[PDB]
Amino acid sequence: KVYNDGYDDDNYDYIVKNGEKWMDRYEIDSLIGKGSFGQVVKAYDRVEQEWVAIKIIKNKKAFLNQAQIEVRLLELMNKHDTEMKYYIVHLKRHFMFRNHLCLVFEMLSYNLYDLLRNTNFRGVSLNLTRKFAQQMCTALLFLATPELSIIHCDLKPENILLCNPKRSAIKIVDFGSSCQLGQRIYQYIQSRFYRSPEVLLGMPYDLAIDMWSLGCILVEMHTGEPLFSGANEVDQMNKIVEVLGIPPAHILDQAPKARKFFEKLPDGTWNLKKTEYKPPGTRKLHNILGVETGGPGGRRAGESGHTVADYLKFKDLILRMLDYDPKTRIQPYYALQHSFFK
Numbered sequence: 434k435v436y437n438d439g440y441d442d443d444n445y446d447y448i449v450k451n452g453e454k455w456m457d458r459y460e461i462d463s464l465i466g467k468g469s470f471g472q473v474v475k476a477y478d479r480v481e482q483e484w485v486a487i488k489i490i491k492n493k494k495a496f497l498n499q500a501q502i503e504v505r506l507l508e509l510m511n512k513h514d515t516e517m518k519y520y521i522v523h524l525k526r527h528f529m530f531r532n533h534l535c536l537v538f539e540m541l542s543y544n545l546y547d548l549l550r551n552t553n554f555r556g557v558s559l560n561l562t563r564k565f566a567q568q569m570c571t572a573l574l575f576l577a578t579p580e581l582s583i584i585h586c587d588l589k590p591e592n593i594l595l596c597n598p599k600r601s602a603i604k605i606v607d608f609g610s611s612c613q614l615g616q617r618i619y620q621y622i623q624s625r626f627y628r629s630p631e632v633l634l635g636m637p638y639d640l641a642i643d644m645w646s647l648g649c650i651l652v653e654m655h656t657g658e659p660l661f662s663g664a665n666e667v668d669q670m671n672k673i674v675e676v677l678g679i680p681p682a683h684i685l686d687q688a689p690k691a692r693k694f695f696e697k698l699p700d701g702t703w704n705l706k707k708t709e710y711k712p713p714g715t716r717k718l719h720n721i722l723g724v725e726t727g728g729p730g731g732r733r734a735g736e737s738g739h740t741v742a743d744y745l746k747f748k749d750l751i752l753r754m755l756d757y758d759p760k761t762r763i764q765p766y767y768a769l770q771h772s773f774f775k
């Protein structure tokens with residue numbers, strides 16, 4: 434009939450009410466986000482005299498233990514920042530309130546998926562995409578810090594918010610799915626579109642999987658559409674094969690889940706499995722990006738920054754970001770050296 438003295442609901446979520454005041458400090462405005470973890474709300478802090486975003490975690494050990502891992506990581510990252518010149522969202526403070534662990538974050542603006550939606554999925558300019566791509570490469574450079582060595586493990590356009598709606602400065606949010614580089618515990622990781630080949634193949638993974646995710650995201654910010662929109666793991670892998678060809682033999686000879694998508698003929702070479710799809714590596718990125726045809730669907734014809742020479746620099750970086758082999762996939766540091774950022 435009632436859960437937690439009438440504060441909680443069926444699904445262990447605090448019933449957020451408008452105009453409620455918590456701890457004589459936070460004035461609740463309205464619900465803004467939702468997910469597995471629980472809820473997210475817009476709140477005004479009377480002390481610091483500023484808007485904040487409070488992540489109200491579900492009243493259940495499982496979710497509370499996950500949140501406590503996130504806090505550990507956010508405080509670990511925020512300890513190595515202070516200046517906030519590395520594009521990780523700032524965990525201000527946390528506390529328990531009516532049996533919910535709350536995480537007070539700075540109030541960020543709408544996310545990149547919201548930005549995509551506002552273009553009717555026609556995408557944004559290369560000049561703005563560069564800016565995002567530069568900040569993210571720096572963000573990943575930060576996470577690659579030896580003492581951190583953090584894998585976000587769930588990069589997508591919804592986990593990339595703007596600081597201000599009239600600026601291009603961004604922040605990465607949601608480190609609930611993240612864990613520091615460790616021995617392989619979990620295998621079904623990342624959102625499907627942005628899921629690396631090594632994960633799909635069930636091989637050892639590291640911080641490179643975040644790079645793959647960025648590659649996929651950056652193309653999508655410009656074209657306006659997901660690069661690899663798989664309806665399931667098999668489809669997802671086949672959309673990748675369309676663009677980049679068949680993964681190298683030496684990868685697939687190691688892959689535990691190789692046979693889920695491919696088949697090893699008597700010669701010792703791999704081909705697809707018939708279930709549809711263009712042949713291996715014939716839906717070229719050059720053509721998707723529209724290097725020599727005025728960009729995605731010709732919509733960027735004769736705009737500054739969108740020349741053949743610009744697009745070619747963009748294309749090259751992305752191909753290095755989408756390198757099948759994670760040992761060779763471009764590292765954050767050298768991505769920033771790339772001529773796309775001159």
Ligand SMILES: CC(=O)Nc1nc2ccc([N+](=O)[O-])cc2s1
Binds near residue numbers: 522538540
């Ligand atoms: C949705 C909106 O208008 N503003 C939001 N800002 C932030 C900032 C941080 C987090 N977070 O969970 O780390 C979520 C949100 S939602």
